[PDB]
Amino acid sequence: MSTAEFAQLLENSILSPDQNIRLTSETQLKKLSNDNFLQFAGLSSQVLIDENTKLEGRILAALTLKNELVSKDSVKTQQFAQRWITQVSPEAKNQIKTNALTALVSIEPRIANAAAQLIAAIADIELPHGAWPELMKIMVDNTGAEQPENVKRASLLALGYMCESADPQSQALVSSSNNILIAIVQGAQSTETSKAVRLAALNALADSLIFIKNNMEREGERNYLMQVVCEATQAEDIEVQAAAFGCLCKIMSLYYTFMKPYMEQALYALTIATMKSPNDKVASMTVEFWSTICEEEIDIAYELAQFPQSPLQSYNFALSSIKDVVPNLLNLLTRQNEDEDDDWNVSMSAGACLQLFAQNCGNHILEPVLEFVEQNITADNWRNREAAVMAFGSIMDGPDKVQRTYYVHQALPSILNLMNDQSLQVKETTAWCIGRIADSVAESIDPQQHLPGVVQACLIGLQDHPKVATNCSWTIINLVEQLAEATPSPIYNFYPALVDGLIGAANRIDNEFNARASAFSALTTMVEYATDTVAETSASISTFVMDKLGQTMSVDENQLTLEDAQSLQELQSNILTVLAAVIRKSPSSVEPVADMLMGLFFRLLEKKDSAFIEDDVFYAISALAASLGKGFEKYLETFSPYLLKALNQVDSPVSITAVGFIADISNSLEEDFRRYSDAMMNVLAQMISNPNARRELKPAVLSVFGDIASNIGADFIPYLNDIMALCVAAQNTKPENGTLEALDYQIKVLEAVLDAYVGIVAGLHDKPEALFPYVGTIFQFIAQVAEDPQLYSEDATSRAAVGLIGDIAAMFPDGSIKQFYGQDWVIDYIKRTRSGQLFSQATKDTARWAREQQKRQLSL
Amino acid sequence: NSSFTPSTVPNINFSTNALRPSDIFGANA
């Protein structure tokens, strides 16, 4: 294939009016990349520089090759690296690199950008292997003072992409850091005339920070770099400042340990000074800097709480600076928007920062904030009163109970009075502030003196502007959550009134500013905390939601706009969520209405556009099944088609909820579940084997295996091997990336494996010969639990895992598995779980059981 | 005195004076 033919393929792939020709071209391109990668890469690089080719085809050439060289998936990354190294000949490599460098200095910025990304991908492969030594010399020379602007900027882009494209948790660019910094800082320093170049340099520097540890450990280099960054924060151009402050914040987060001299000698004074800028963007920059400091010092405190002997040390920047920083933040609170728009601004950032200060510094925040509140809560300007309640609410988390209780008692009359303020913004924030008081120190509201006035303010507010009503629903949730646990609880005396008020807000005609949905959410809370003493109010909710569902189903949807229809769907979702909670909370009350409910649910399922609410319908059907037990069997024939269709819609979230139905009936049908188990297993085996399955399906299915095994017991043995294979495969799957999303997903998978093993060990309690060949596998998983804090720090996870240690031990008194019970990590894990006081007492009891059984195992 | 004692007089010359990144980074000077 020639350059011209390849270019024609690319062009046709994106520009042909004929979709057939587009797909044919894409297939032929991928096929050449598979059959002759050397030629594919060479030709791609030649089209990149071919002026005779349309711009989009040249950009596409570069980006497609780039996407065959780097990936997010680490495994794909490694495969691409080895393919470049072994399958592209040295002469081909040299030609591709030369062509990419030619395109980098193109007068067309789109060509230059694509070329920069391609250069970055190749560099990410070669520099860690001590290759392409010419590149960094070219980059350093290219950002030299007398180079033209486009060459500087394109090269700085390439350096940024280089650092961003490398794995964050890697040493791939360490060996190049010196030259990277030279090239980057050359563009960042004050002598550089182009704002675009300084911006690109600072953004690249931010990208590079994770690769310059060795440089930051050198005092002279660290000093010079920090000097350049600070110089940039004082630059005249506001975008340059913004970029430099991004750098400063990232440096503080990554290299906190080195910041004390820079804080003392300059940054404290500088950032405090600019926090008073009349420009909201500048001030916002300084605010973000101090929020970063607070976040890091809170994280240090947390880590030292988990391990008192960790080397990390806080310098207490925030604590020492409160006197000088906090008054400026408070002043920023009066820069709200003169309505309604709700768009973010510096005043909201300053509020979040103030809350970080209070969490980090406790009682030290009180004096300046309380002074501001006193000065402004009765001011004539609505901005000052709103700022006052914002500040007061923002210090309710951090200080000790004595101080908070004292000042809540002192301020509650004025705060409740602000619920009658003429300013909508003031009332909105006042309702929020009452929620903050309730949420952190609910006992601060004296049951006789102020709780009736608090409840009354919430009830009036639910009838106010929807913005106020939403915050009143949130506040009611906080009140119930924080007061229900006390015995007696005062909040139950107000349950009828509260419920009545919430029903009224749920009966709003619209959901403007989320006031109606929020009310439904609070109703769910009311249900979940209801006691027998307020049984009647529970009944009131049940009656309301059932009737309400009926009402929504009288609405002719062919007279609705798209927006109208979305509103109706969200309302039906709110209703069905509360209804599911009602059904689960009082199973005895459900039988008489079961038929009617299913009649409605099937109707909802047969509606056109049922795909939008079918998830919530399945949640309610599952709750009804759980509550009726064997009484649900009469609906199974009619429900089966829907269930199977939902289970097979592996792309849609409805399949997850359908798995949740299986989980419910496995528990609620008792003996009667066995007659369906085989069919369920078959379906599930297909589902988890479907490549079109969304990721969230995998953990759900794993967990439900545990449910099934738990209820069918020995009937599970013929499936055991297959299921164990799945569990093993799942527990040995590394995170896809180092990103937070991949690690969190992996945690979900491991949690589901824990569910599976718990259910299996419970089900096979009497069949140790069936479990025996998997004990070591289970112990490998448990070791994973003991190693990763995202697992063992969770009370329920540790309770289940240490429970497995004990129960498995109890199943084998023959000593056939005693070899696992002498391991230091097992003993240590049992002891950490038994002693850690943030673990509940049920967890510690389970750890005791595990310790008894482990010691007995060593006795054998 | 290993405590945070900031100055109200900022000075960002942590080391106008001429300075090259090439003379700093990797320079060991």
Side-chain angles (χ1 to χ4, degrees), chain A residues 425-461:
Chain A
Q425 299 93 309
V426 171
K427 289 188 291 184
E428 173 174 42
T429 301
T430 297
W432 171 84
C433 183
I434 295 170
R436 296 279 296 176
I437 297 172
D439 199 29
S440 287
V441 60
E443 296 75 16
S444 56
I445 311 171
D446 184 86
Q448 273 77 52
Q449 175 162 12
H450 289 133
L451 187 58
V454 167
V455 168
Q456 210 56 48
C458 289
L459 292 178
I460 298 305

Short mmCIF file of all heavy atoms in Angstrom, two decimals, chain A residues 425-461:
data_model
loop_
_atom_site.label_atom_id
_atom_site.label_comp_id
_atom_site.label_asym_id
_atom_site.label_seq_id
_atom_site.Cartn_x
_atom_site.Cartn_y
_atom_site.Cartn_z
N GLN A 425 -32.51 33.80 49.46
CA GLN A 425 -31.19 33.21 49.70
C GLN A 425 -30.95 33.02 51.20
O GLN A 425 -30.41 32.00 51.63
CB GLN A 425 -30.10 34.07 49.08
CG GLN A 425 -30.20 34.23 47.57
CD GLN A 425 -30.97 35.48 47.16
OE1 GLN A 425 -32.08 35.72 47.63
NE2 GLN A 425 -30.38 36.28 46.28
N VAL A 426 -31.34 34.01 52.00
CA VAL A 426 -31.13 33.90 53.44
C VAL A 426 -31.90 32.72 54.00
O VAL A 426 -31.38 31.95 54.82
CB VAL A 426 -31.52 35.21 54.15
CG1 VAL A 426 -31.53 35.02 55.67
CG2 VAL A 426 -30.57 36.32 53.75
N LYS A 427 -33.16 32.56 53.59
CA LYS A 427 -33.96 31.45 54.12
C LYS A 427 -33.41 30.11 53.65
O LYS A 427 -33.42 29.13 54.41
CB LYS A 427 -35.41 31.60 53.68
CG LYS A 427 -36.15 32.74 54.36
CD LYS A 427 -37.64 32.71 54.03
CE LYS A 427 -37.90 33.05 52.59
NZ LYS A 427 -39.36 33.10 52.33
N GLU A 428 -32.95 30.04 52.41
CA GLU A 428 -32.38 28.80 51.90
C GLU A 428 -31.18 28.38 52.74
O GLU A 428 -31.08 27.23 53.20
CB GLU A 428 -31.97 29.00 50.43
CG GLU A 428 -31.21 27.85 49.82
CD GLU A 428 -30.98 28.04 48.32
OE1 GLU A 428 -30.66 29.17 47.91
OE2 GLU A 428 -31.14 27.06 47.57
N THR A 429 -30.25 29.32 52.96
CA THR A 429 -29.06 28.97 53.72
C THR A 429 -29.38 28.76 55.19
O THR A 429 -28.75 27.92 55.84
CB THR A 429 -28.01 30.06 53.53
OG1 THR A 429 -27.72 30.15 52.13
CG2 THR A 429 -26.72 29.74 54.32
N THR A 430 -30.36 29.48 55.74
CA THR A 430 -30.77 29.25 57.12
C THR A 430 -31.33 27.85 57.32
O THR A 430 -31.02 27.18 58.32
CB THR A 430 -31.81 30.31 57.52
OG1 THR A 430 -31.22 31.61 57.46
CG2 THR A 430 -32.34 30.06 58.95
N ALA A 431 -32.17 27.38 56.38
CA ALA A 431 -32.65 26.01 56.46
C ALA A 431 -31.48 25.03 56.44
O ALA A 431 -31.43 24.08 57.23
CB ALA A 431 -33.62 25.72 55.31
N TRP A 432 -30.54 25.24 55.52
CA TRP A 432 -29.33 24.42 55.50
C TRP A 432 -28.61 24.47 56.85
O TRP A 432 -28.18 23.44 57.38
CB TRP A 432 -28.41 24.89 54.38
CG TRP A 432 -27.04 24.27 54.39
CD1 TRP A 432 -26.69 23.06 53.85
CD2 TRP A 432 -25.84 24.83 54.94
NE1 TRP A 432 -25.35 22.83 54.04
CE2 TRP A 432 -24.80 23.90 54.70
CE3 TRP A 432 -25.55 26.02 55.61
CZ2 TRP A 432 -23.49 24.13 55.11
CZ3 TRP A 432 -24.24 26.25 56.02
CH2 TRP A 432 -23.23 25.31 55.77
N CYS A 433 -28.47 25.67 57.42
CA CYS A 433 -27.75 25.82 58.68
C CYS A 433 -28.42 25.02 59.79
O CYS A 433 -27.75 24.41 60.63
CB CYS A 433 -27.68 27.30 59.05
SG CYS A 433 -26.75 27.63 60.54
N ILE A 434 -29.76 25.02 59.81
CA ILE A 434 -30.47 24.23 60.80
C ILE A 434 -30.18 22.75 60.59
O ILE A 434 -30.00 22.00 61.55
CB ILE A 434 -31.98 24.54 60.74
CG1 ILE A 434 -32.21 26.01 61.14
CG2 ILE A 434 -32.77 23.62 61.66
CD1 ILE A 434 -33.60 26.51 60.90
N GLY A 435 -30.11 22.32 59.32
CA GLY A 435 -29.72 20.95 59.04
C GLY A 435 -28.32 20.62 59.53
O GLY A 435 -28.07 19.51 59.99
N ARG A 436 -27.38 21.56 59.41
CA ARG A 436 -26.02 21.35 59.90
C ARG A 436 -25.99 21.21 61.42
O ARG A 436 -25.30 20.33 61.97
CB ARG A 436 -25.13 22.52 59.45
CG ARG A 436 -24.96 22.62 57.94
CD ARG A 436 -23.91 21.64 57.45
NE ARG A 436 -22.60 22.00 58.00
CZ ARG A 436 -21.48 21.31 57.83
NH1 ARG A 436 -21.48 20.20 57.11
NH2 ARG A 436 -20.36 21.74 58.39
N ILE A 437 -26.72 22.09 62.12
CA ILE A 437 -26.83 21.99 63.56
C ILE A 437 -27.40 20.63 63.93
O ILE A 437 -26.87 19.92 64.80
CB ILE A 437 -27.70 23.13 64.11
CG1 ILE A 437 -27.04 24.48 63.83
CG2 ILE A 437 -27.93 22.97 65.61
CD1 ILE A 437 -27.88 25.68 64.15
N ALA A 438 -28.48 20.23 63.27
CA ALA A 438 -29.10 18.94 63.56
C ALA A 438 -28.14 17.81 63.27
O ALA A 438 -28.07 16.83 64.02
CB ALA A 438 -30.38 18.77 62.75
N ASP A 439 -27.37 17.93 62.20
CA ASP A 439 -26.60 16.80 61.71
C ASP A 439 -25.42 16.49 62.62
O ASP A 439 -25.12 15.31 62.87
CB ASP A 439 -26.11 17.07 60.29
CG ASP A 439 -25.72 15.80 59.56
OD1 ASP A 439 -26.30 14.74 59.88
OD2 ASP A 439 -24.84 15.86 58.67
N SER A 440 -24.74 17.52 63.13
CA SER A 440 -23.54 17.28 63.91
C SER A 440 -23.76 17.30 65.42
O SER A 440 -23.11 16.54 66.15
CB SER A 440 -22.46 18.30 63.54
OG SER A 440 -21.92 18.01 62.25
N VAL A 441 -24.65 18.16 65.93
CA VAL A 441 -24.91 18.20 67.36
C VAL A 441 -26.41 18.32 67.64
O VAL A 441 -26.87 19.26 68.28
CB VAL A 441 -24.10 19.34 68.03
CG1 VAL A 441 -24.43 20.72 67.47
CG2 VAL A 441 -24.23 19.30 69.54
N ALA A 442 -27.19 17.30 67.21
CA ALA A 442 -28.64 17.35 67.35
C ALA A 442 -29.07 17.45 68.80
O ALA A 442 -30.14 18.00 69.09
CB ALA A 442 -29.29 16.10 66.74
N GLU A 443 -28.27 16.91 69.73
CA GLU A 443 -28.61 17.07 71.13
C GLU A 443 -28.49 18.53 71.59
O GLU A 443 -28.94 18.84 72.69
CB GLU A 443 -27.71 16.17 71.96
CG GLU A 443 -27.91 14.68 71.67
CD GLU A 443 -27.31 14.23 70.35
OE1 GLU A 443 -26.48 14.96 69.78
OE2 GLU A 443 -27.67 13.13 69.87
N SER A 444 -27.89 19.41 70.77
CA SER A 444 -27.81 20.83 71.09
C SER A 444 -29.19 21.50 71.08
O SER A 444 -29.34 22.60 71.63
CB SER A 444 -26.90 21.59 70.10
OG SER A 444 -27.30 21.42 68.75
N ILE A 445 -30.18 20.88 70.44
CA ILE A 445 -31.52 21.45 70.35
C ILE A 445 -32.35 20.89 71.50
O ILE A 445 -32.79 19.74 71.46
CB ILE A 445 -32.16 21.15 69.00
CG1 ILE A 445 -31.19 21.49 67.86
CG2 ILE A 445 -33.47 21.94 68.87
CD1 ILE A 445 -31.65 21.01 66.49
N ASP A 446 -32.58 21.72 72.52
CA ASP A 446 -33.26 21.25 73.72
C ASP A 446 -34.66 20.76 73.37
O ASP A 446 -35.44 21.52 72.78
CB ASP A 446 -33.32 22.38 74.74
CG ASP A 446 -33.94 21.94 76.05
OD1 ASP A 446 -33.20 21.42 76.91
OD2 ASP A 446 -35.16 22.11 76.23
N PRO A 447 -35.03 19.52 73.74
CA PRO A 447 -36.36 19.01 73.35
C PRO A 447 -37.52 19.91 73.74
O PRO A 447 -38.49 20.01 72.98
CB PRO A 447 -36.43 17.66 74.07
CG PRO A 447 -35.02 17.24 74.22
CD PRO A 447 -34.24 18.51 74.46
N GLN A 448 -37.47 20.54 74.91
CA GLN A 448 -38.57 21.40 75.34
C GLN A 448 -38.44 22.82 74.81
O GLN A 448 -39.43 23.41 74.37
CB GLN A 448 -38.65 21.43 76.88
CG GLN A 448 -39.48 20.32 77.49
CD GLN A 448 -38.76 18.99 77.51
OE1 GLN A 448 -37.63 18.89 77.98
NE2 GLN A 448 -39.41 17.95 76.99
N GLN A 449 -37.22 23.37 74.83
CA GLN A 449 -37.05 24.80 74.57
C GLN A 449 -37.07 25.11 73.08
O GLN A 449 -37.73 26.07 72.66
CB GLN A 449 -35.75 25.28 75.21
CG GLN A 449 -35.42 26.73 74.90
CD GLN A 449 -34.41 27.32 75.88
OE1 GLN A 449 -33.78 26.59 76.65
NE2 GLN A 449 -34.26 28.64 75.85
N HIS A 450 -36.35 24.34 72.26
CA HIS A 450 -36.14 24.72 70.87
C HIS A 450 -36.56 23.69 69.83
O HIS A 450 -36.82 24.09 68.69
CB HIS A 450 -34.66 25.06 70.65
CG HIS A 450 -34.24 26.34 71.29
ND1 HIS A 450 -33.09 26.45 72.05
CD2 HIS A 450 -34.82 27.57 71.30
CE1 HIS A 450 -32.98 27.69 72.49
NE2 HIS A 450 -34.01 28.39 72.05
N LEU A 451 -36.64 22.41 70.17
CA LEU A 451 -37.03 21.44 69.16
C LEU A 451 -38.41 21.74 68.57
O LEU A 451 -38.56 21.63 67.34
CB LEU A 451 -36.96 20.02 69.75
CG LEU A 451 -37.18 18.88 68.76
CD1 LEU A 451 -36.17 18.91 67.62
CD2 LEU A 451 -37.14 17.52 69.46
N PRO A 452 -39.42 22.13 69.34
CA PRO A 452 -40.70 22.49 68.70
C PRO A 452 -40.56 23.63 67.71
O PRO A 452 -41.19 23.60 66.65
CB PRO A 452 -41.61 22.85 69.89
CG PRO A 452 -40.98 22.18 71.08
CD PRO A 452 -39.50 22.21 70.81
N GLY A 453 -39.75 24.64 68.04
CA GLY A 453 -39.53 25.74 67.11
C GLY A 453 -38.74 25.32 65.88
O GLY A 453 -38.98 25.83 64.78
N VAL A 454 -37.78 24.41 66.04
CA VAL A 454 -37.06 23.87 64.89
C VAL A 454 -38.02 23.13 63.96
O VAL A 454 -38.05 23.38 62.75
CB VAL A 454 -35.90 22.97 65.37
CG1 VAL A 454 -35.31 22.15 64.23
CG2 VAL A 454 -34.81 23.79 66.03
N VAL A 455 -38.82 22.23 64.52
CA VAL A 455 -39.77 21.48 63.70
C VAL A 455 -40.73 22.43 63.01
O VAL A 455 -40.99 22.30 61.81
CB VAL A 455 -40.52 20.44 64.57
CG1 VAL A 455 -41.72 19.85 63.81
CG2 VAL A 455 -39.56 19.34 65.01
N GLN A 456 -41.24 23.42 63.74
CA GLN A 456 -42.18 24.36 63.14
C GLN A 456 -41.53 25.13 62.00
O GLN A 456 -42.15 25.35 60.95
CB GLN A 456 -42.72 25.32 64.20
CG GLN A 456 -44.14 25.81 63.92
CD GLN A 456 -45.13 24.66 63.75
OE1 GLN A 456 -45.17 23.73 64.56
NE2 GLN A 456 -45.92 24.72 62.68
N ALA A 457 -40.27 25.54 62.16
CA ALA A 457 -39.58 26.23 61.08
C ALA A 457 -39.44 25.33 59.86
O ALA A 457 -39.57 25.79 58.72
CB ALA A 457 -38.20 26.71 61.53
N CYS A 458 -39.18 24.04 60.08
CA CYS A 458 -39.09 23.12 58.95
C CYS A 458 -40.44 22.97 58.27
O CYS A 458 -40.51 22.90 57.03
CB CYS A 458 -38.58 21.76 59.42
SG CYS A 458 -36.83 21.73 59.89
N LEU A 459 -41.53 22.92 59.05
CA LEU A 459 -42.86 22.74 58.49
C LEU A 459 -43.29 23.95 57.68
O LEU A 459 -43.88 23.80 56.60
CB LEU A 459 -43.87 22.46 59.60
CG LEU A 459 -43.74 21.13 60.34
CD1 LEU A 459 -44.78 21.06 61.43
CD2 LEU A 459 -43.88 19.95 59.39
N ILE A 460 -43.03 25.15 58.19
CA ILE A 460 -43.28 26.35 57.39
C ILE A 460 -42.42 26.34 56.14
O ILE A 460 -42.88 26.70 55.04
CB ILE A 460 -43.04 27.62 58.24
CG1 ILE A 460 -43.99 27.68 59.44
CG2 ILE A 460 -43.17 28.88 57.38
CD1 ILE A 460 -45.46 27.57 59.10
N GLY A 461 -41.15 25.95 56.27
CA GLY A 461 -40.25 26.00 55.13
C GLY A 461 -40.61 25.03 54.03
O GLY A 461 -40.36 25.31 52.85
#
